[PDB]
Write a protein that binds this ligand. Structure first.
Ligand SMILES: Cc1cn([C@H]2C=C[C@@H](COP(=O)(O)OP(=O)(O)OP(=O)(O)O)O2)c(=O)[nH]c1=O
Ligand SMILES: *P(=O)(O)OC[C@@H]1C=C[C@H](n2cc(C)c(=O)[nH]c2=O)O1
Ligand SMILES: [Mg+2]
Ligand SMILES: [Mg+2]
Ligand SMILES: [Mg+2]
Lengths: 394, 555
DNA sequence: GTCCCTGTTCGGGCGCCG
DNA sequence: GGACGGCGCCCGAACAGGGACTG
């Protein structure tokens, strides 16, 4: 017996066009969909269903197995409507329990909104269209409708391990503990056996705003410092640029050396102190969206901020790949998006909306070649001002 | 005959009804054509005579077919189309010959009266009512029982029904390739000719079992096969020729035709250009307005005509070999490319000339051409090509280091064919010793649009220019331009405009702004430019002085 | 807020296919 | 002549954001 589900009032289903797929991904989708159709999990449909949702596939690392992935972001937006200890455990493993969802039927009236279309190489055939009959992987409604079965399944493992923290976010279990990694993996295998029916969050650190150290300062150095401190005062009202700025009176050469007064030196040391204190008055709002901004600092370096209101950052961090003899900005950005989203899920249970510093077309040409999660966050494309890149640079 | 496939259920949009539209006068030749067509369709059950219980009607006509010997019945279903439910179209793109592989045996065949062989949902039939006027004799009323031509549901319902019908055959014959473009079937196989022909007969009997005839008239058995507007020879494909208009006065419609034909030609003709001819359509009034060819458009059209006088062909895809894409630059943001596997044997060609953004440079445009080609390659061949680009590795290295955005080009090798793509100037990372320091600024009054732009310099020089009908952003750009004009080969410039800084920092060499173009010319002239930012109205020295100066008349 | 400037989407011509 | 659907190109209209400004 199914659970009747509805769209949010006044919203029609998704009508998102299918984007080009590589030969590999099409062949994997055709095989996967053949098996799913032969098991009743999906049905071929026609064009009289006006809905569509893009579909692709990802081949997990060192794995010969492909995984189908539906981009249910639009449908999840339109579909009707957290353990603090998880972010503290020594180690956290992420299990892909999405297969379970195919055991539960989907409300017959809702199935039409899960339509998707397999393309073909060189448009040999028209697109081939399916809809779901079961709880789809990637749909907001699947973990919800399944939560009771999930809890009934997990009850005894939780009773026998009260120190373990298990958290569900849509297709995944996040299992965290304080065990030696060998005992930890042994317990994880106990769970993966029980379900026949690696992260280390306490090492995530915050990336503070930092000020240059110099024994000689030019007019240019001080101008730069004063602009950076002026920007930072919006995050930290204690920042003051009175005396440093006082040193810049007149109309001076950029390379003129300015000796720092006592007052200016003390102002600088006080600002260095103030940038240590945590940002005051920043409270997570569940009903609002997490916004993640990323900046390319260059040389494999990336900085990011998670906030909900401007300058009220909930977190600031960095992702720092290595030298980069053959470096791929888009790959590294995709990896950074996945890491930041993983952190957001662990800490708050939401995924962030990403302001991505890339051209839309670059991103859409390549990001699915580096994707490895079963979720996809919302995002948007921004032309960052190089000023903020300089502000967060390390 | 009529396919026994199940019908596709269709409804009208909520709270709407069927068309009630008077039949218009047809000529007698088309009345006779329609009468003969309709008496035969009615004998076959494809249309049914309706009575007075049917309140609906929509106009009918007929036109010649490609085979000029035959007529085609059409219905102006625009009103019923408005009132019909939405569909998800299943034709995702157009197949392309450069994506065909070498096959031992090939057949191209066509379905006879394809639409009229697919049944229509019974509940919907009444909305297809029409009327044949007589050469007065009374005129006969009908409705459709099969798919009509002019209805918006027909193409998708037919393409989907064709796919369902071909599925059992495709399953039994995984290694026979059937390109299915609406009702035209290209069929290729790795069989000897006798066994191929036998398989073709099996395919024809399979279709006939499902109600689709394949008239021999449209059964191509010998090369060159006529397919999708191309000629498919055994080892090369050609495009059936392109006749450009040779008119003397040119209207907007004439230019749309010319540009469409050139774009079509650019899939196999290298070097086609449409920049001038296209910008010649900016802000036009209507299709009939007469545009005079600018001398630039004249020259471009002449070059294209010479290009098109040349003989050219494509080759087929060999999946065991790499795809290579070589890009070439022409001016005004125009690029061409060739995709090939063997050195001088194009699979296809293309052009990219889209103008993205108010301000840009040649490295950005090259990156977006690479992106366009990558996704086109994925559609056609399902894989990404290896690139050959007219840009030195160090140029790209410099840009990817400097550029504050994520940017990337796939596997690529430098190609020494000029015009080489280069950055035309580079901002300094540090202030310059010995170069004068200009503090620049601009103010503009939002009411009067009067403004001022100017600089002070650490060596005591000051200048203020007044401007009419201007904006704050424009005065900031003007102040930068002025400092550039009045400085030596090396110069430090301090601005407070993150607008202007954001523009110049991204190193444009083209812009749609005349002022930004003048600035770019100055930047190219300089040996060294260092451009710093400070916050406005914070009293930072130098900036304070110039802000005071340019605010005098304006704030 | 308003004004300015920039980017994106979408509809309307034309090309091509059936 | 003229009806339909697909894809392509190009351009302009109607949006959407973000940065500077006024007293
Ligand atoms: C060329 C064309 C086609 N169509 C629709 C209708 C039939 C299918 C196939 O086209 P067709 O092969 O030329 O017409 P068809 O009805 O099959 O008849 P035949 O002449 O091939 O026997 O696409 C259309 O609606 N408008 C058009 O201009
Ligand atoms: P649809 O049935 O309109 O497909 C076009 C069909 C296939 C080939 C045939 N054809 C024949 C000839 C002689 C020609 O010059 N062009 C052409 O397309 O029409
Ligand atoms: Mg036909
Ligand atoms: Mg045909
Ligand atoms: Mg200013």
């Amino acid at each position: 017996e199914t659970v009747p589900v509805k769209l949010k009032p006044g919203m029609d289903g998704p009508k998102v066009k299918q984007w080009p797929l590589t030969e590999e991904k099409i062949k994997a989708l055709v095989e996967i969909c053949t098996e799913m159709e032969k098991e009743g999990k999906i049905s071929k449909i026609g064009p009289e269903n006006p809905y569509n949702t893009p579909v692709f596939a990802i081949k997990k690392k060192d794995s010969t197995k492909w995984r189908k992935l539906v981009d249910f972001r639009e449908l999840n937006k339109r579909t009707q409507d957290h353990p603090a200890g998880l972010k503290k455990k020594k180690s956290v493993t992420v299990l892909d329990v999405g297969d379970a969802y195919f055991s539960v039927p989907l409300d017959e009236d809702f199935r039409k909104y899960t339509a998707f279309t397999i393309p073909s190489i060189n448009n040999e055939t028209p697109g081939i269209r399916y809809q779901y009959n079961v709880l789809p992987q990637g749909w907001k409604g699947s973990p919800a409708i399944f939560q009771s079965s999930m809890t009934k399944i997990l009850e005894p493992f939780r009773k026998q391990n009260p120190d373990i923290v298990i958290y569900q976010y849509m297709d995944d279990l996040y299992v965290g503990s304080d065990l030696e990694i060998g005992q930890h993996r042994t317990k994880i295998e106990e769970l993966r056996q029980h379900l026949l029916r690696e992260l280390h969050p306490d090492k995530w650190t915050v990336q503070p705003i930092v000020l240059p150290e110099k024994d000689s300062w030019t007019v240019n150095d001080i101008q730069k410092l004063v602009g950076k401190l002026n920007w930072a005062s919006q995050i930290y009202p204690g920042i003051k640029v009175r005396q440093l700025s006082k040193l810049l009176r007149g109309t001076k050469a950029l390379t003129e050396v300015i000796p720092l007064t006592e007052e200016a030196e003390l102002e600088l040391a006080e600002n260095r102190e103030i940038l240590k204190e945590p940002v005051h008055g920043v409270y997570y709002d569940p009903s609002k969206d997490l916004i993640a901004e990323i900046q390319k600092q260059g040389q494999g370096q990336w900085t990011y901020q998670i906030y909900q209101e401007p300058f009220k950052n909930l977190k600031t961090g960095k992702y720092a790949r290595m030298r980069g003899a053959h470096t791929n900005d888009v790959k590294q950005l995709t990896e950074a998006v996945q890491k930041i989203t993983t952190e957001s899920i662990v800490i708050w249970g939401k995924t962030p909306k990403f302001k991505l510093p890339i051209q839309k077309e670059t991103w859409e040409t390549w990001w699915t070649e580096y994707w490895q999660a079963t979720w996809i966050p919302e995002w948007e494309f921004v032309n960052t001002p190089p000023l903020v890149k300089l502000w967060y640079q390390l | 005959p009529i396919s026994p496939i199940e019908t596709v259920p269709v409804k009208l949009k909520p709270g709407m009804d069927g068309p009630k539209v008077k039949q218009w006068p047809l000529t007698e030749e088309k009345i006779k054509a329609l009468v003969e067509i309709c008496t035969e369709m009615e004998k076959e059950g494809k249309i049914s005579k309706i009575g007075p219980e049917n309140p609906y009607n929509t106009p009918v006509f007929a036109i010649k077919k490609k085979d000029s010997t035959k007529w085609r019945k059409l219905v102006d279903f625009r009103e019923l189309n408005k009132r019909t439910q939405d569909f998800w179209e299943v034709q995702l793109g157009i197949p392309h010959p450069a994506g065909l592989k070498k096959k031992k045996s090939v057949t191209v065949l066509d379905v006879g009266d394809a639409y009229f062989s697919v049944p229509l949902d019974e509940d919907f039939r009444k909305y297809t009512a029409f009327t044949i006027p007589s050469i007065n004799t009374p005129g006969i009323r009908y409705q459709y029982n099969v798919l009509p031509q002019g209805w918006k549901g027909s193409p998708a319902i037919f393409q989907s029904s064709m796919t369902k019908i071909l599925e059992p055959f495709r399953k039994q014959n995984p290694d026979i390739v059937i390109y299915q473009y609406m009702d035209d079937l290209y069929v290729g196989s790795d069989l000897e000719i006798g066994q191929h022909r036998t398989k073709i007969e099996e395919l024809r009997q399979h279709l006939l079992r499902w109600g689709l005839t394949t008239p021999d008239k449209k059964h191509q058995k010998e090369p060159p096969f006529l397919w999708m507007g191309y000629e498919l020879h055994p080892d090369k494909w050609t495009v059936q020729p392109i006749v450009l208009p040779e008119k003397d006065s040119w209207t907007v419609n004439d230019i749309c035709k010319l540009v469409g034909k050139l774009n079509w030609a650019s899939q196999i003709y290298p070097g086609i250009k449409v920049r001038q001819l296209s910008k010649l359509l900016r802000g036009t009034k209507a299709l009939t307005e007469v545009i005079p060819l600018t001398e630039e458009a004249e020259l471009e059209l002449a070059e294209n005509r010479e290009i098109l006088k040349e003989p050219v062909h494509g080759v087929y895809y060999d999946p065991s070999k790499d795809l290579i894409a070589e890009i070439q630059k022409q001016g005004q943001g125009q690029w061409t490319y060739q995709i090939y596997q063997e050195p001088f044997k194009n699979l296809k060609t293309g052009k990219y000339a889209r103008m993205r953004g108010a301000h840009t440079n040649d490295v950005k445009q090259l990156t977006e051409a690479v992106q366009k080609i990558t996704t086109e390659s994925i559609v056609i061949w399902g894989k990404t090509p290896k690139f050959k680009l007219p840009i030195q590795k160090e140029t790209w290295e410099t840009w990817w280091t400097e550029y504050w955005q994520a940017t990337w080009i796939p596997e690529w090798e430098f190609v020494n064919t000029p015009p080489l793509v280069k950055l035309w100037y580079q901002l300094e990372k540090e202030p310059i010793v010995g170069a004068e320091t200009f503090y620049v600024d601009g103010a503009a009054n939002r009411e009067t649009k009067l403004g001022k732009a100017g600089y002070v310099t650490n060596r005591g020089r000051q200048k203020v220019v007044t401007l009419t009908d201007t904006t704050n952003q424009k005065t900031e750009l003007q102040a930068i331009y002025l400092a550039l004009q009045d400085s030596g080969l090396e110069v430090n410039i301090v601005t407070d405009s993150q607008y202007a800084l954001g523009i110049i920092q991204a190193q444009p060499d083209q812009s749609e702004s005349e002022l930004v173009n003048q600035i770019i010319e100055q930047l190219i002239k300089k040996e060294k430019v260092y451009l710093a930012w400070v916050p406005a109205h914070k009293g930072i020295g130098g900036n304070e002085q110039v802000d005071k100066l340019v605010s005098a008349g304006i704030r």
